[PDB]
């Protein structure tokens, strides 16, 4: 295998690793080759799941982690349930409390840079955007951060723990440059 793949398997829990493998193979990418994107898929997955964990019991409909056609099935149902507009791109969550889809981003640049790319690419206006970084920074639409401070602070801490673990294994440099 590879050093990055070995690190991913001992860093994330097996359920996350399995969902990342499925999501990567579903789009023609092999986790054993594109190991940097393998780490980023695991990171993005865990962040979405910690995010959904931060709300109430039945607040978030998780979209990420499902297969493509079932994910769009849940989106069509949410749209016909509440009446919100069907987004052009697959989001990560839906907030039943605020009635909006959420796109979650985990970047290795300025949260402003990645927000600008995502906000211009989405072009749906209704989809709420929330970006985390590997340095503790976050940016969200209308400065509305959805969750309480304690839940967001846990995610940031986890991201920085992943960053330190990669550097100890001298993997962080190629990982930050691969994005």
Ligand X SMILES: C[C@H](C[C@@H](C[C@H](C[C@@H](C[C@@H](CCN1CCCC1=O)N1CCCC1=O)N1CCCC1=O)N1CCCC1=O)N1CCCC1=O)N1CCCC1=O
Ligand Y SMILES: Nc1ncnc2c1ncn2CCNC(=O)c1nc([C@@H]2CCCN2C(=O)OCc2ccccc2)[nH]c(=O)c1O
Give the active site residues.
64, 92, 118
> Could you tell me the two tokens for 119?
């906000």
Cα 81 to chain centroid, rounded: 25
Residues 74-93 that bind ligand Y (CB under 6 A): 90, 92
Q: Residues marked as binding for Mn(2+)?
A: 44, 58, 64, 92, 103-104
| Contacts with ligand X, residue ranges (CB under 6 A) | 13, 15, 49-50, 52-53, 62, 65-66
CA 138 vs CA 1, 9, 113: distances in Å: 34, 27, 12
Residue at token pair 């991201």: 159
Supply the minimum distance, in Å, between the C-beta of residue 1 and Mn ion: 26
- 45 touches 16 (CB < 8 A): yes
3-state class of 171 per DSSP? coil
Q: Which of these segments, 22-30, 129-137, 146-154, 171-179, binds ligand Y (CB under 6 A)? A: 22-30
Chain positions contacting ligand Y, by CB under 6 A? 23-24, 27, 29, 37, 40-41, 44, 64, 90, 92, 104-105
């Amino acid at each position: 295998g590879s050093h990055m793949e070995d690190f991913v398997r001992q860093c994330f829990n097996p359920m996350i690793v399995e969902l990342a493998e499925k999501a990567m193979k579903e789009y023609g990418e092999d986790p054993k080759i594109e190991t940097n994107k393998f780490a980023a898929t695991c990171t993005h997955l865990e962040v979405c799941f910690m995010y959904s964990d931060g709300g109430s019991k039945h607040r978030f409909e998780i979209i990420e982690g499902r297969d493509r056609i079932m994910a769009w099935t849940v989106v069509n149902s949410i749209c016909n349930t509440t009446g919100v507009e069907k987004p052009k791109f697959l989001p990560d969550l839906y907030d039943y409390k605020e009635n909006r889809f959420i796109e979650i981003g985990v970047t290795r640049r300025e949260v402003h840079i990645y927000y600008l790319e995502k906000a211009n690419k989405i072009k749906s206006e209704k989809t709420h955007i929330h970006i985390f970084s590997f340095t503790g920074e976050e940016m969200a639409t209308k400065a509305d951060y959805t969750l309480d401070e304690e839940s967001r602070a846990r995610i940031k801490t986890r991201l920085f723990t992943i960053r330190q673990e990669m550097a100890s294994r001298s993997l962080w440099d190629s990982f930050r440059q691969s994005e």
